[PDB]
Design a protein around this ligand. Sequence first.
Ligand SMILES: Nc1ncnc2c1ncn2[C@@H]1O[C@H](COP(=O)(O)OP(=O)(O)OP(=O)(O)O)[C@@H](O)[C@H]1O
Length: 378
Amino acid sequence: GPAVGINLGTTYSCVGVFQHGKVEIIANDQGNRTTPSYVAFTDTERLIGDAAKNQVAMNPTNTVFDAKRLIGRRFDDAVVQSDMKHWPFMVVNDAGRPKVQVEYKGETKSFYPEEVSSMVLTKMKEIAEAYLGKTVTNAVVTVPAYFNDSQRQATKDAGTIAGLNVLRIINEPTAAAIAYGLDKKVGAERNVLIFDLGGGTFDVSILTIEDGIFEVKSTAGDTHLGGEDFDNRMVNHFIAEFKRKHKKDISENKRAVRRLRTACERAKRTLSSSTQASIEIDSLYEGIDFYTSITRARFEELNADLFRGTLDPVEKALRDAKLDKSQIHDIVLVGGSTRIPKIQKLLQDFFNGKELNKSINPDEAVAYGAAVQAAILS
Ligand SMILES: Nc1ncnc2c1ncn2[C@@H]1O[C@H](COP(=O)(O)OP(=O)(O)OP(=O)(O)O)[C@@H](O)[C@H]1O
């Protein structure tokens, strides 16, 4: 069977396969081309992907996500300590290693970050196999450029326990470059800027490519800025609106909020193609139906400061890399959040009208590149 390319992301994962000179991005059972990096445990089963995310508000303490933030890290890590203050699930310390603790079938169980990730990885593999109509063994999995040997190790391990023969672990910015073919030899040095804004992380990487050899000159970004922060702004906005029209605050009801958030994330995606979207939520609080809508104009101003700040890390990346705007040859958009019009405008304006690389769905770019690489390595 063919080797596949997999993008193991913080919020979503994607799997592609190179076959007949073309790369195919494989959709799941629900028909989505990317699946949530969620795993949920219940009295009767273990849900992975969409099925998992589709019940988080009902099973918050037993629904695991953000495993990418834990992977290859230690419990004593200041990162872990800060992060765990926001997860609805338990993170325990097993001899220095962090472990997620859930209740599965009435019994208490705990897993290592790599095991959780292998569950998502297994879902991608069967998604691929269902499409390919054959077993998938070899694979190329992606990882950020800043991941150290421990993190890369853990990612490789997650692959092995998932029954995948990880041919290689390549960086996400490099995979993106390969997706557009910016790795071909043109007898000259080329500077590429990868602007990656996903569900929860923002990475800016400046690559230098000469003779087919990549060289990450610089990196910058924010580990806690992504599409979810945009959703939060909408949520707080609608919470205030509901409070106005119905004299009722819904902040305390955790389910009402999570349901509202799910509606917002969806309206947000629509807003990337339309100028306004309706929020139709039956019986949000008490028996009160919440029917309303937002416009792109409002959505933009709700996140104005966030969108604008996206340029600071870009300036710094350039600065550290010892380059000027005019020196970067190609700019490729990565991450689902880059589909937002205002982000594209903002970046283009910063690079004085330069054309942005974005013909390939940004949230499928990394997988796409990995699939090509997997093909060459087989
Ligand atoms: N049309 C769209 N407009 C805006 N945001 C979108 C759109 N389509 C998808 N997204 C967003 O993209 C995000 C998911 O991005 P992606 O699939 O690239 O994530 P990822 O690699 O898991 O990201 P990270 O590693 O930062 O979490 C979500 O915040 C989702 O709302």
